[PDB]
């Protein structure tokens, strides 16, 4: 028996642990994972005619947006990422920093922080969103100005409806104050720089911090993009990139489905049951991608009975 699983690259570590566990309890089974970007993984099914037993997206909304109803009848939001501020024992004021004061530490002139290119990398525009959202949370209307506007060519306007709009110029025009900011397209350059102490703090996902053994400051769920329940707070910030595309703050939440054309749906059910069950929950916890428990499903009445038991 073969089980074909198409998953987002960022699900690679937990899905490997899932594959091992699944093969252990099911001796006959060959689990064949294919990792790609989330939209790319979906398009294999919805455009390229490829058949998977399981599709897991790093943005759950791609599923209803591109697969429903032709390729899927249900989906489940099962885990999340969360923006954090990473540091190490070599970072300035690392002993002082906490959820209440992180932006005050970053305002100190001798502290340097890193984030990804907001044109290129969702981690990049997400660092801007989280910093702007902080203003309303901590009642301090100068956080984004002091940390980002004062030190880059990014600008900010307020759209008639109250929404904060961050404008990112051409990458070559962001021109960061390099005493305050390290900005890179390649995330590995930023995590290397944090490790050597070239930067003090780094805006990245919790999963990436845990993989590197970095310390981190957990940020309030009202601002950290992790939580379905704060979706209306997150949408109060938008980012416009050089090309004109606009992105809106929103929860970073993973989704799963078994496609309508799965060649082994019964084996897929067993795999998703492992994923949504206690075993999969611990695996996700251990990779810094906290599970949503029970998972929240749409189209629950069309799900296999076994999976219905594992969703809200």
JSON list of N, CA, C and O in Angstrom, two decimals, residues 19-50:
[
{"chain": "A", "resi": 19, "resn": "UNK", "atom": "N", "xyz": [5.15, 10.31, 9.34]},
{"chain": "A", "resi": 19, "resn": "UNK", "atom": "CA", "xyz": [5.43, 9.18, 8.44]},
{"chain": "A", "resi": 19, "resn": "UNK", "atom": "C", "xyz": [6.05, 7.95, 9.17]},
{"chain": "A", "resi": 19, "resn": "UNK", "atom": "O", "xyz": [5.61, 6.81, 8.97]},
{"chain": "A", "resi": 20, "resn": "UNK", "atom": "N", "xyz": [7.04, 8.20, 10.02]},
{"chain": "A", "resi": 20, "resn": "UNK", "atom": "CA", "xyz": [7.73, 7.15, 10.79]},
{"chain": "A", "resi": 20, "resn": "UNK", "atom": "C", "xyz": [6.72, 6.43, 11.69]},
{"chain": "A", "resi": 20, "resn": "UNK", "atom": "O", "xyz": [6.59, 5.21, 11.65]},
{"chain": "A", "resi": 21, "resn": "UNK", "atom": "N", "xyz": [5.98, 7.22, 12.47]},
{"chain": "A", "resi": 21, "resn": "UNK", "atom": "CA", "xyz": [4.98, 6.68, 13.38]},
{"chain": "A", "resi": 21, "resn": "UNK", "atom": "C", "xyz": [3.90, 5.88, 12.64]},
{"chain": "A", "resi": 21, "resn": "UNK", "atom": "O", "xyz": [3.52, 4.78, 13.08]},
{"chain": "A", "resi": 22, "resn": "UNK", "atom": "N", "xyz": [3.42, 6.43, 11.53]},
{"chain": "A", "resi": 22, "resn": "UNK", "atom": "CA", "xyz": [2.40, 5.76, 10.71]},
{"chain": "A", "resi": 22, "resn": "UNK", "atom": "C", "xyz": [2.87, 4.44, 10.12]},
{"chain": "A", "resi": 22, "resn": "UNK", "atom": "O", "xyz": [2.12, 3.46, 10.07]},
{"chain": "A", "resi": 23, "resn": "UNK", "atom": "N", "xyz": [4.11, 4.40, 9.64]},
{"chain": "A", "resi": 23, "resn": "UNK", "atom": "CA", "xyz": [4.66, 3.16, 9.09]},
{"chain": "A", "resi": 23, "resn": "UNK", "atom": "C", "xyz": [4.91, 2.10, 10.18]},
{"chain": "A", "resi": 23, "resn": "UNK", "atom": "O", "xyz": [4.74, 0.91, 9.93]},
{"chain": "A", "resi": 24, "resn": "UNK", "atom": "N", "xyz": [5.26, 2.56, 11.38]},
{"chain": "A", "resi": 24, "resn": "UNK", "atom": "CA", "xyz": [5.45, 1.70, 12.56]},
{"chain": "A", "resi": 24, "resn": "UNK", "atom": "C", "xyz": [4.17, 0.95, 12.95]},
{"chain": "A", "resi": 24, "resn": "UNK", "atom": "O", "xyz": [4.20, -0.27, 13.18]},
{"chain": "A", "resi": 25, "resn": "UNK", "atom": "N", "xyz": [3.04, 1.66, 12.99]},
{"chain": "A", "resi": 25, "resn": "UNK", "atom": "CA", "xyz": [1.76, 1.03, 13.31]},
{"chain": "A", "resi": 25, "resn": "UNK", "atom": "C", "xyz": [1.06, 0.41, 12.10]},
{"chain": "A", "resi": 25, "resn": "UNK", "atom": "O", "xyz": [0.08, -0.31, 12.27]},
{"chain": "A", "resi": 26, "resn": "UNK", "atom": "N", "xyz": [1.55, 0.69, 10.89]},
{"chain": "A", "resi": 26, "resn": "UNK", "atom": "CA", "xyz": [1.01, 0.08, 9.67]},
{"chain": "A", "resi": 26, "resn": "UNK", "atom": "C", "xyz": [2.14, -0.47, 8.79]},
{"chain": "A", "resi": 26, "resn": "UNK", "atom": "O", "xyz": [2.60, 0.21, 7.87]},
{"chain": "A", "resi": 27, "resn": "UNK", "atom": "N", "xyz": [2.56, -1.73, 9.05]},
{"chain": "A", "resi": 27, "resn": "UNK", "atom": "CA", "xyz": [3.75, -2.33, 8.43]},
{"chain": "A", "resi": 27, "resn": "UNK", "atom": "C", "xyz": [3.79, -2.35, 6.89]},
{"chain": "A", "resi": 27, "resn": "UNK", "atom": "O", "xyz": [4.85, -2.14, 6.31]},
{"chain": "A", "resi": 28, "resn": "UNK", "atom": "N", "xyz": [2.65, -2.59, 6.24]},
{"chain": "A", "resi": 28, "resn": "UNK", "atom": "CA", "xyz": [2.63, -2.68, 4.77]},
{"chain": "A", "resi": 28, "resn": "UNK", "atom": "C", "xyz": [2.82, -1.40, 3.97]},
{"chain": "A", "resi": 28, "resn": "UNK", "atom": "O", "xyz": [3.05, -1.44, 2.76]},
{"chain": "A", "resi": 29, "resn": "UNK", "atom": "N", "xyz": [2.77, -0.25, 4.65]},
{"chain": "A", "resi": 29, "resn": "UNK", "atom": "CA", "xyz": [2.51, 1.03, 3.99]},
{"chain": "A", "resi": 29, "resn": "UNK", "atom": "C", "xyz": [3.76, 1.83, 3.59]},
{"chain": "A", "resi": 29, "resn": "UNK", "atom": "O", "xyz": [4.65, 2.04, 4.40]},
{"chain": "A", "resi": 30, "resn": "UNK", "atom": "N", "xyz": [3.80, 2.27, 2.34]},
{"chain": "A", "resi": 30, "resn": "UNK", "atom": "CA", "xyz": [4.83, 3.19, 1.86]},
{"chain": "A", "resi": 30, "resn": "UNK", "atom": "C", "xyz": [4.28, 4.63, 1.79]},
{"chain": "A", "resi": 30, "resn": "UNK", "atom": "O", "xyz": [3.53, 4.97, 0.87]},
{"chain": "A", "resi": 31, "resn": "UNK", "atom": "N", "xyz": [4.67, 5.46, 2.75]},
{"chain": "A", "resi": 31, "resn": "UNK", "atom": "CA", "xyz": [4.26, 6.87, 2.75]},
{"chain": "A", "resi": 31, "resn": "UNK", "atom": "C", "xyz": [5.20, 7.66, 1.85]},
{"chain": "A", "resi": 31, "resn": "UNK", "atom": "O", "xyz": [6.40, 7.75, 2.12]},
{"chain": "A", "resi": 32, "resn": "UNK", "atom": "N", "xyz": [4.65, 8.23, 0.78]},
{"chain": "A", "resi": 32, "resn": "UNK", "atom": "CA", "xyz": [5.42, 9.04, -0.17]},
{"chain": "A", "resi": 32, "resn": "UNK", "atom": "C", "xyz": [5.01, 10.52, -0.08]},
{"chain": "A", "resi": 32, "resn": "UNK", "atom": "O", "xyz": [3.99, 10.93, -0.66]},
{"chain": "A", "resi": 33, "resn": "UNK", "atom": "N", "xyz": [5.82, 11.29, 0.66]},
{"chain": "A", "resi": 33, "resn": "UNK", "atom": "CA", "xyz": [5.61, 12.73, 0.81]},
{"chain": "A", "resi": 33, "resn": "UNK", "atom": "C", "xyz": [6.25, 13.49, -0.34]},
{"chain": "A", "resi": 33, "resn": "UNK", "atom": "O", "xyz": [7.30, 13.08, -0.86]},
{"chain": "A", "resi": 34, "resn": "UNK", "atom": "N", "xyz": [5.61, 14.60, -0.73]},
{"chain": "A", "resi": 34, "resn": "UNK", "atom": "CA", "xyz": [6.17, 15.57, -1.67]},
{"chain": "A", "resi": 34, "resn": "UNK", "atom": "C", "xyz": [6.03, 16.94, -1.02]},
{"chain": "A", "resi": 34, "resn": "UNK", "atom": "O", "xyz": [4.91, 17.37, -0.70]},
{"chain": "A", "resi": 35, "resn": "UNK", "atom": "N", "xyz": [7.15, 17.60, -0.76]},
{"chain": "A", "resi": 35, "resn": "UNK", "atom": "CA", "xyz": [7.13, 18.92, -0.16]},
{"chain": "A", "resi": 35, "resn": "UNK", "atom": "C", "xyz": [7.23, 20.00, -1.24]},
{"chain": "A", "resi": 35, "resn": "UNK", "atom": "O", "xyz": [8.03, 19.90, -2.16]},
{"chain": "A", "resi": 36, "resn": "UNK", "atom": "N", "xyz": [6.41, 21.04, -1.11]},
{"chain": "A", "resi": 36, "resn": "UNK", "atom": "CA", "xyz": [6.48, 22.21, -2.01]},
{"chain": "A", "resi": 36, "resn": "UNK", "atom": "C", "xyz": [5.85, 23.39, -1.30]},
{"chain": "A", "resi": 36, "resn": "UNK", "atom": "O", "xyz": [5.41, 23.24, -0.15]},
{"chain": "A", "resi": 37, "resn": "UNK", "atom": "N", "xyz": [5.81, 24.56, -1.95]},
{"chain": "A", "resi": 37, "resn": "UNK", "atom": "CA", "xyz": [5.08, 25.69, -1.41]},
{"chain": "A", "resi": 37, "resn": "UNK", "atom": "C", "xyz": [3.61, 25.26, -1.33]},
{"chain": "A", "resi": 37, "resn": "UNK", "atom": "O", "xyz": [3.22, 24.28, -1.99]},
{"chain": "A", "resi": 38, "resn": "UNK", "atom": "N", "xyz": [2.81, 25.97, -0.53]},
{"chain": "A", "resi": 38, "resn": "UNK", "atom": "CA", "xyz": [1.40, 25.56, -0.35]},
{"chain": "A", "resi": 38, "resn": "UNK", "atom": "C", "xyz": [0.56, 25.71, -1.61]},
{"chain": "A", "resi": 38, "resn": "UNK", "atom": "O", "xyz": [-0.13, 24.76, -2.00]},
{"chain": "A", "resi": 39, "resn": "UNK", "atom": "N", "xyz": [0.62, 26.88, -2.26]},
{"chain": "A", "resi": 39, "resn": "UNK", "atom": "CA", "xyz": [-0.11, 27.09, -3.51]},
{"chain": "A", "resi": 39, "resn": "UNK", "atom": "C", "xyz": [0.32, 26.10, -4.59]},
{"chain": "A", "resi": 39, "resn": "UNK", "atom": "O", "xyz": [-0.52, 25.59, -5.33]},
{"chain": "A", "resi": 40, "resn": "UNK", "atom": "N", "xyz": [1.61, 25.82, -4.65]},
{"chain": "A", "resi": 40, "resn": "UNK", "atom": "CA", "xyz": [2.14, 24.84, -5.60]},
{"chain": "A", "resi": 40, "resn": "UNK", "atom": "C", "xyz": [1.61, 23.42, -5.33]},
{"chain": "A", "resi": 40, "resn": "UNK", "atom": "O", "xyz": [1.28, 22.67, -6.27]},
{"chain": "A", "resi": 41, "resn": "UNK", "atom": "N", "xyz": [1.56, 23.06, -4.05]},
{"chain": "A", "resi": 41, "resn": "UNK", "atom": "CA", "xyz": [1.01, 21.76, -3.64]},
{"chain": "A", "resi": 41, "resn": "UNK", "atom": "C", "xyz": [-0.46, 21.63, -4.06]},
{"chain": "A", "resi": 41, "resn": "UNK", "atom": "O", "xyz": [-0.86, 20.59, -4.57]},
{"chain": "A", "resi": 42, "resn": "UNK", "atom": "N", "xyz": [-1.25, 22.68, -3.85]},
{"chain": "A", "resi": 42, "resn": "UNK", "atom": "CA", "xyz": [-2.66, 22.70, -4.25]},
{"chain": "A", "resi": 42, "resn": "UNK", "atom": "C", "xyz": [-2.82, 22.59, -5.77]},
{"chain": "A", "resi": 42, "resn": "UNK", "atom": "O", "xyz": [-3.66, 21.83, -6.26]},
{"chain": "A", "resi": 43, "resn": "UNK", "atom": "N", "xyz": [-2.00, 23.34, -6.51]},
{"chain": "A", "resi": 43, "resn": "UNK", "atom": "CA", "xyz": [-2.09, 23.35, -7.98]},
{"chain": "A", "resi": 43, "resn": "UNK", "atom": "C", "xyz": [-1.74, 22.03, -8.63]},
{"chain": "A", "resi": 43, "resn": "UNK", "atom": "O", "xyz": [-2.22, 21.74, -9.72]},
{"chain": "A", "resi": 44, "resn": "UNK", "atom": "N", "xyz": [-0.92, 21.22, -7.97]},
{"chain": "A", "resi": 44, "resn": "UNK", "atom": "CA", "xyz": [-0.65, 19.86, -8.47]},
{"chain": "A", "resi": 44, "resn": "UNK", "atom": "C", "xyz": [-1.96, 19.12, -8.65]},
{"chain": "A", "resi": 44, "resn": "UNK", "atom": "O", "xyz": [-2.17, 18.45, -9.65]},
{"chain": "A", "resi": 45, "resn": "UNK", "atom": "N", "xyz": [-2.85, 19.26, -7.65]},
{"chain": "A", "resi": 45, "resn": "UNK", "atom": "CA", "xyz": [-4.16, 18.61, -7.69]},
{"chain": "A", "resi": 45, "resn": "UNK", "atom": "C", "xyz": [-5.15, 19.35, -8.58]},
{"chain": "A", "resi": 45, "resn": "UNK", "atom": "O", "xyz": [-5.79, 18.75, -9.43]},
{"chain": "A", "resi": 46, "resn": "UNK", "atom": "N", "xyz": [-5.27, 20.66, -8.41]},
{"chain": "A", "resi": 46, "resn": "UNK", "atom": "CA", "xyz": [-6.31, 21.45, -9.07]},
{"chain": "A", "resi": 46, "resn": "UNK", "atom": "C", "xyz": [-6.02, 21.85, -10.53]},
{"chain": "A", "resi": 46, "resn": "UNK", "atom": "O", "xyz": [-6.95, 22.22, -11.27]},
{"chain": "A", "resi": 47, "resn": "UNK", "atom": "N", "xyz": [-4.75, 21.77, -10.95]},
{"chain": "A", "resi": 47, "resn": "UNK", "atom": "CA", "xyz": [-4.33, 22.14, -12.33]},
{"chain": "A", "resi": 47, "resn": "UNK", "atom": "C", "xyz": [-3.60, 21.01, -13.07]},
{"chain": "A", "resi": 47, "resn": "UNK", "atom": "O", "xyz": [-3.87, 20.74, -14.25]},
{"chain": "A", "resi": 48, "resn": "UNK", "atom": "N", "xyz": [-2.68, 20.34, -12.37]},
{"chain": "A", "resi": 48, "resn": "UNK", "atom": "CA", "xyz": [-1.79, 19.37, -13.01]},
{"chain": "A", "resi": 48, "resn": "UNK", "atom": "C", "xyz": [-2.29, 17.92, -13.00]},
{"chain": "A", "resi": 48, "resn": "UNK", "atom": "O", "xyz": [-1.59, 17.02, -13.48]},
{"chain": "A", "resi": 49, "resn": "UNK", "atom": "N", "xyz": [-3.49, 17.70, -12.47]},
{"chain": "A", "resi": 49, "resn": "UNK", "atom": "CA", "xyz": [-4.17, 16.40, -12.52]},
{"chain": "A", "resi": 49, "resn": "UNK", "atom": "C", "xyz": [-3.53, 15.32, -11.68]},
{"chain": "A", "resi": 49, "resn": "UNK", "atom": "O", "xyz": [-3.76, 14.14, -11.91]},
{"chain": "A", "resi": 50, "resn": "UNK", "atom": "N", "xyz": [-2.73, 15.72, -10.70]},
{"chain": "A", "resi": 50, "resn": "UNK", "atom": "CA", "xyz": [-2.05, 14.75, -9.87]},
{"chain": "A", "resi": 50, "resn": "UNK", "atom": "C", "xyz": [-2.94, 14.33, -8.70]},
{"chain": "A", "resi": 50, "resn": "UNK", "atom": "O", "xyz": [-3.79, 15.11, -8.24]}
]
